[PDB]
Design an enzyme around this catalytic site. Structure first.
Site, mmCIF file in Angstrom:
data_model
loop_
_atom_site.group_PDB
_atom_site.id
_atom_site.type_symbol
_atom_site.label_atom_id
_atom_site.label_comp_id
_atom_site.label_asym_id
_atom_site.label_seq_id
_atom_site.Cartn_x
_atom_site.Cartn_y
_atom_site.Cartn_z
ATOM 1 N N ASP A 51 18.027 -11.758 -5.534
ATOM 2 C CA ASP A 51 18.135 -10.491 -4.779
ATOM 3 C C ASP A 51 16.845 -9.933 -4.804
ATOM 4 O OD1 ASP A 51 19.303 -8.138 -4.075
ATOM 5 O OD2 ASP A 51 18.856 -7.393 -6.007
ATOM 6 N N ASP A 53 16.023 -6.079 -4.514
ATOM 7 C CA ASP A 53 15.639 -4.771 -4.928
ATOM 8 C C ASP A 53 16.006 -4.555 -6.426
ATOM 9 O OD1 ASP A 53 14.235 -3.291 -2.657
ATOM 10 O OD2 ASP A 53 16.388 -2.964 -1.670
ATOM 11 N N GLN A 445 30.771 -6.336 -19.289
ATOM 12 C CA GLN A 445 30.856 -7.044 -18.169
ATOM 13 C C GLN A 445 29.523 -8.029 -18.282
ATOM 14 O OE1 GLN A 445 30.944 -3.733 -15.193
ATOM 15 N NE2 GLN A 445 32.845 -4.577 -14.693
HETATM 16 MG MG LIG Z 1 19.243 -5.422 -6.440
#
Ligand SMILES: [Mg+2]
Ligand SMILES: [Mg+2]
Ligand SMILES: [Mg+2]
Ligand SMILES: [Mg+2]
Ligand SMILES: [Mg+2]
Ligand SMILES: [Mg+2]
Ligand SMILES: [Mg+2]
Ligand SMILES: [Mg+2]
Lengths: 481, 481, 481, 481
Positions: A51, A53, A445
């Protein structure tokens, strides 16, 4: 006062000492550790995926949140909200990530994995136990009721976490408005907490996709984005043992501008090396990923015209080609084009839902969760480790007490006061991972879906690339005794 | 050879010695322990609720499964399946609970919480690693794809677990049929694994609801149902500190016949006591519960005519009344009628999905999972504890090996051979809770959703009723180091 | 008194005079006419397809409805309804087909194509205009709200149409019950009209599929089923110019028994001919059709074992074979197996929804609607044609009256009284096709979706098989002036 | 050449002669008639409601379509479509309203109410009978398959109707592209007809809501919008006998600018009267209606700040107030606020689906359909009435021909050639209402759902307001004979 991006910048400034024993030395300090929930043999990983950001591009705090906050407040005032909103100012000590906004009652909630209420805040007023039972009879929410409850899961949500609390506080205390269970009344205009929340949500989206936030970020990248000279080194080491790919929700133009900055050093992978364009570090570059949908049906695979930053007309049907940039598609695009299966892939991201949970559950990908706050969390957890130990001790004593048929009471109060003392060291909404001895939904999680996790993806630099990250075997209670 | 219901019967035969130190002595032997996943202060429990089938009424093994198997095979032959099915005979050493039937490929699968394949059996042929990649490229299934995958979660599913393997084996080896990837071909008739599975599923339902299984059970209750004189004692102790209720999917007539047997002793709660009707042990009795729907919308609340065993016409709108028997309704019926909130309730059941997961997640109830097999599992886990330790040791060695850049290979083979040796001690499909060092889906859901669990609900008798069942505080990896 | 099946039996008794001019003579009497909504060139029809129940097998009235009524009342009493239901007795003068049961308010409604209320009956009390506005403010229902409104579309629904009115009347007038807007109250038992309706619906299904109705029908076929010696003649004429097929929802055993009766004559197609088995008249026989689903996805194509009447295991994959009987499948089975397109097919049926609307709209089939009542309707429409003319005249006068700025009032009353007088000649719920000058929903769907329609499919015998059934070209209002 | 907006402008220029006999004289010329599908007593209408775009504000043709076309082509070129699109130019003789775009095969279809193909055009090539069977085996489409088929129902769709045909023609004939069944191929880029259609659809929306179309319209209102001095007169006459309301999908600012123009005369209702602001003609003004959703759940009722043109924050809860402007809400807002039931309301609109069908079916409103093209259609239908008569004659002869057992053939060719000759007089896609003797889907929905219809709503001026619009009673075929 030192924020979490501050500790990330300090490490980001330091050059890579790749001496083997300096690496071992470095990766035992916990800031620079990769933490292990399930065991992973790096030797078997064929594709490293990323990823962008808050994974590759960590935004500086609290500058970035403050800017997003300021721009969001101005969008609201511009659409009709009252002018007093302009006197709001982002306060980084209030919001913790992963909070739940109850659009029915206008509360921010910190919950556990089962929906039990750990903290309830109406505006800036922290509702305690008995008062919360008026709205939460069983002190519990059904968090899969996504029509009522919104979970604020990304660091992008930190400004609106604070803003929503600001709004509730403002309308609650402004005499032009009359408070009701479900919102605010000003004559013949009724503003529900739910419609308030939707406006905030819409204002954040708009600011990001039609407003000036991206513009203001890209014109002062040094103010808003952490840069690290060790990134091109990590990626080129990854390219030696496997394939590297980028899969981001952002569009090509923003991605290009941010990634150009992340590689903007007078050198390539290491000092002395010729600088290389950021695209040359990736075997596959995919933008407009639309995660988590990306890990299901996805969308139609397009090809970016990199000269114009527009998509070419049509679905791209061809082979993986040097220089091509993809848009949309699905997780199967990666698998097909790089000839990998889910468990050959380590995908590195910061969205516990959009990057980690969904790739794990729906595709069987291996997962690395970046948690930028972890640097600050680790500093606090060690400093006040004393309080957690007392918390453990009080629970054990509380049991060896019930087992002997109002002492059990002053302990329960002592448990509640240590819990509060511990929580306040992280901020008004407490640690990301717990309230006292009770783990958060987010924490649970992370343990469940992130095979590995760390304050930064860069910590992988400090481990040899045949390393076997090992978690302890898990035992059920009856398997111990 | 001693089955798991055999160990339950042995304990069921023994009288309650309620001397305080005999109880402590008893509840440290693990057969009689209540095991703790999350901490629970029994003092705070106000309502004890019960499932019936395989909770209060544990069916003897392998008699009951064999009977269900025999009746299911005859339903299939009666609807047109070939006569050779009548030579099948239930074999209790084959099936383990919690297996996944892949209706696409006709395999039984044992998976972990993430859908990773631990065992793959086509008929009676155990497919190993590389062969499984032909159908499971990533060695993984999306278990939430409930259109393709059926999880065999209850002890009621044990006969059809074995039967499905019988059917695949038969059609695979009978020369009248031609095997395809997806089923079997006999001229112009194609029988998919999926349609085969549906017939089996339908035959089991029919046998239970239109066939003779209930009739044959009730005419030889001593052959088919475990009885325990300590049950009326546990329930009356529960009635002293709180309310007791029954919430079962079975209808009134079957429930009455089974519960009359469970209380059919020459005495009431303890020897010397007047016998009491089974209904007098319950503050609320609800049949036709339709769980898990019961824990959501539920259905319309009806009132049973207990003289005829038929429902009265109309929705019952009245108060909780002595002697009334309810049908349908919802979890909120209990809460309303007994004036309890979810966390005041301990619901005791054996359906990891229908009783435990759904009451926990959707209503915040406290949960007690009955696992009848646990007696046998505990006997085996202790006997062959040596093999698990070697498994741990081999994993640690495998790591301190990768970290030094074909030795890593003979270890992997040694790991695979110990795993197999360990698994075979439980049966051909291995332990309910693991395959070697890898926990099963079932195990992970027990830990996640059962606050307490035990070989039998009766183990609660051995704990004082202010006891605080305590689990250890859970720490994330970064919280230890 | 002569029922509609009585007029069908009279014609059914008469032999076929195939002299060309007797046919022309016969098919100008309207009882024996095929009526035309859209034009159809029989020359282009390649496949004639058939429903069975109330198409080929018309059940005698009121014997069959009375039997279904009696058996349905006994199912209700047997499940707990009060004993007074046994004194109910079927009254054929009350129910008209196509009525709407409002499960909210317990009314039977006759509506137009737009949902406007033409008749509203609560039990046996006919609610008039202003009283109906209390429940129907706009005198209108949204008939696509199939959760509230049930349309009683088949002659199978005639017994329950009457029964529902009986039930409302009974509970309304029995002093044990207290009437509410939405149902009936007897102490703590509340019986909604909706749950009442579901029981009735369930009782009808059960009677047909688990009760004795089929048994009682087949043991006195002469009492319950119209027989016609001209049927084998029509079908064999159809076989000469095209293919014939049967597609019925009924199972094989019931279909075989009913069709054996329909062909049980001392002769085949005509007197003197060797008798032929009913199956020899069909190029394709399909049972368990599951219409209207049949005209969409359908279900899996199976093959009937005609010796046992059970389905063979598996999906049938083979060719169209002489002697084979099919089960399930879809409309595409017919098209594939007979090599026909939708507009090569004339499908003949009596279910305005399940046979006609769905085959037309979803597949583009040509349609023939059998309306058994049409014989009686035609007798009444001609007898009281005077009243309809007066109705037309009063409307024209009412207009040439408004156009001149309490005379308009006595006319509106005269219109309402002629409407009532006309309607009562058909029965208490009026004609199938209208209430006065307002057409029913049913009438409008016949015109819209039935290309042809007739009192009986046998009327096709009286037309040469190259005949072009011609409707007049339709003009919009602006196309005339 | 005289377009349909041209005939509307001619009438729009003429002053109202309200002499009673001039009105009768005027309203027998069919241009100025209100046509009647179902009877309606104007005396009973209490509320007259209005759409705006193409109802009150008829846009001039072909200027407006040409402008929308030009702006849509430039949006496409701007997003990446090839530059040759800029040489396209709107041709008003090609598109007819109500065509169906098949996104699978890239055809424009004219269909009947049953989905039968009347015209099939691929680009500009008209596919005839046998060629169409290759893609439409049964010459039929399931028009409720809204995933494949898009119906171009509004005059706003006329530019994209032509554009889609332009695009298919261009890609089909440009040698850079290779035609496939489902779209076009240019190397590794495949452009499906479906994705082509979505781009066109998106470009039209964007042009309307983010582009310059509204700006260009409002800066030359005289070029683009028909104005009629008789509008304020009709509305004030309506206000005398009832209430008037506006319910439009357009926003407040565009609505205000367009309605200011529509009332921009040196006078009010009639010459000599003081001019009145357009808002004073309405008892209720509602923008952002979001029809057809408006006729179901609708959306939250908001209040427009008329000074800023922004919505006030919150749901508006108050009474109907002079000067207030509403946004969103639902059809029930009108009913509540004006105290009307559905059948007290005449809603006047031009969207056969969004205004007429949905208000009729879902709410029981009375309906008036404005069809701007009807002026031109009426001129052509009368001119070439000879051809339609020949069409009728040929059908009758074709029947009296089949009924006598290759003459039937030359007639079928003569029928096909007259049909074509007739159709070409309206344009290349024929009349809005038919192809020869076969009525269009659009025509059939007008008859079904528009109680009244006319070339313009202004034709209501020519009828006294107690007038009873009378349609002839409809008879089923068996009711005539
Ligand atoms: Mg991100
Ligand atoms: Mg709690
Ligand atoms: Mg159970
Ligand atoms: Mg694995
Ligand atoms: Mg039928
Ligand atoms: Mg009416
Ligand atoms: Mg409009
Ligand atoms: Mg046709």
């Amino acid at each position: 006062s030192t924020s979490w991006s501050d500790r990330l910048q300090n490490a980001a400034d330091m050059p890579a000492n790749m001496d083997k024993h300096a690496l071992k030395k470095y990766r035992r300090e916990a800031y620079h550790r990769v933490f292990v929930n399930r065991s992973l043999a790096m030797e078997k990983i064929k594709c490293f995926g990323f990823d962008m950001d808050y994974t590759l591009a960590v935004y500086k705090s609290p500058e970035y949140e403050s800017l997003g906050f300021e721009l969001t407040v101005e969008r609201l005032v511009s659409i009709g909200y009252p002018q007093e909103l302009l006197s709001f100012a982002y306060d980084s000590t209030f919001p913790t990530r992963g909070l739940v906004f109850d659009t029915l009652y206008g509360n921010l909630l910190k919950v556990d994995a089962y929906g039990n209420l750990l903290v309830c805040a109406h505006g800036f007023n922290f509702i305690r136990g008995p008062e919360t039972r008026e709205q939460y009879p069983n002190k519990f929410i059904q968090r899969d009721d996504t029509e009522r409850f919104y979970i604020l899961n990304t660091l992008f949500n930190l400004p609106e976490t604070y803003l929503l609390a600001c709004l509730v506080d403002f309308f609650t205390n402004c005499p032009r408005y009359t408070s009701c269970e479900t919102g605010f009344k000003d004559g013949d205009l009724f503003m529900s907490y739910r419609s308030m929340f939707q406006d905030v949500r819409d204002a954040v989206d708009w600011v990001h996709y039609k407003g000036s936030l991206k513009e203001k970020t890209v014109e002062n990248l040094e103010k808003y984005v952490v840069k690290d000279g060790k990134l091109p080194l990590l990626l080129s080491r990854m390219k030696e043992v496997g394939k590297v790919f980028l899969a981001t929700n952002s569009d090509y133009k923003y991605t290009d501008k941010i990634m150009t900055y992340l590689f903007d050093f007078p050198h390539g992978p290491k000092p002395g090396s010729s600088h290389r364009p950021w695209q040359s570090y990736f075997d596959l570059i995919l933008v407009d990923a639309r995660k988590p949908l990306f890990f299901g049906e996805g969308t139609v695979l397009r090809q970016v015209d990199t000269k114009t930053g527009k998509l070419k007309i049509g679905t791209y049907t061809g082979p993986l080609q040097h220089g091509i940039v993809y848009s949309g598609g699905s997780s199967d695009t990666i698998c097909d084009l790089l000839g990998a299966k889910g468990k050959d892939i380590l995908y590195i991201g910061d969205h516990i839902f959009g990057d980690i949970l969904k790739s794990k559950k729906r595709q069987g990908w291996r997962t690395f969760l970046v948690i930028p706050e972890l640097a600050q969390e680790l500093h606090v957890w060690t400093d006040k480790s004393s309080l957690f130990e007392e918390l453990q001790s009080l629970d054990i004593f509380l049991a060896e007490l019930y087992k002997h048929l109002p002492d059990i009471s002053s302990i329960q109060r002592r448990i509640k006061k240590v819990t509060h003392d511990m929580d306040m060291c992280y901020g008004m909404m407490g640690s990301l991972f717990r309230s006292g001895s009770r783990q958060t939904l987010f924490a649970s999680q992370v343990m469940r879906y992130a095979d590995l996790y760390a304050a930064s993806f860069i910590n992988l630099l400090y481990y040899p690339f045949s390393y076997l990250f090992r978690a302890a075997h898990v035992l059920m209670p009856h398997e111990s005794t």
